[PDB]
Each structure stands twice: as C-alpha cells, then as structure tokens.
Amino acid sequence: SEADRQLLEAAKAGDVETVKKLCTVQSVNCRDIEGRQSTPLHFAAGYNRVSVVEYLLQHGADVHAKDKGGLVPLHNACSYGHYEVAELLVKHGAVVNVADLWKFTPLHEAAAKGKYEICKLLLQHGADPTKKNRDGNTPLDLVKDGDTDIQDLLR
C-alpha cells in the first residue's frame, strides 16, 4: 500500500506530522514487505526518532512485534545505541530478555556496542547477563576488550 510505504518512510525520517496523518488501524503495524518486515516502530526505534516512537506507542504500535530475524524494536534501539528510545520501549513494556532467532538479547546488543546507559537500563530491569546466544556467548563475552567501563559494569 502507498500509504504504508509513506508511513514507514516518515517513521525513518522522524516526520511525526506525516506519521500522524498516515496512521490507521492497519498501517500502524504494517510491515516493510520488501525489506526485513520491519514495522513503523522498528524504524522509528532504529533511526532514533523519539517523537515518532512516542506517538506510535500512544496510537496502537505493538512494542512486541518481531521483524524477519525475530528482532523487536528494543533490539534495534540497543543495536544502534539509541538510549531514549530504549528507555521508552522498556517503560512501555518491552521484554528486556527477549531473544531473536540467534538468541541475542537486547543486552547482547548493548554490550557489543558498548552503550553504558543502555546496559545500565537493561540490567536495572532484570536483563540476564548470563544468557548465552547461539555462539555460546553471554553479553559480557561480546564486550570489546577495549571497552573497560562496560566490562566492569557487567562484571
């Protein structure tokens, strides 16, 4: 659908006014069929569009939606290091220990990317730093050797 394509794009662009105009029952959780099946909320989260994330969360977006690889919008926020988005998604019920297809959790992502505040957020909401992904790696295992502050945080 043409409105769907424009909504997904407005979410990436952070054009909240266009998002407001294009949001319908069906479009608010539509999927990018030719891409990774991301929803508007995956894109807003991944592109750090805080106002769009806030609007979507208030108007019918599913915080738990998975893309083709099993990523929820919290994974996108953590992977690209967007703290405010990660906090909003967690405050709105994102499951902090959710695993994608590869068994990576948001904390695996935040640890690998070395995002202090995001790791702190997830740990405070019960993120399990003992969880192994399919490489047998815990989030602590994914912290870069150069990233001393994150290592210490996760012990």
Binding site: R36, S38, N48, G69, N76, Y80, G81, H82
Partner: peptide, 12 residues
C-alpha cells in the same frame, strides 16, 4: 549468513 542488526542508523 552473517547476522544482521536490523533496520536503523548510528548516531553521530
């Protein structure tokens, strides 16, 4: 296949 991070962009 390589594991993909999902749709999004880095902050500056």
């Amino acid at each position: 296949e390589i594991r993909e991070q999902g749709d999004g962009a880095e902050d500056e």
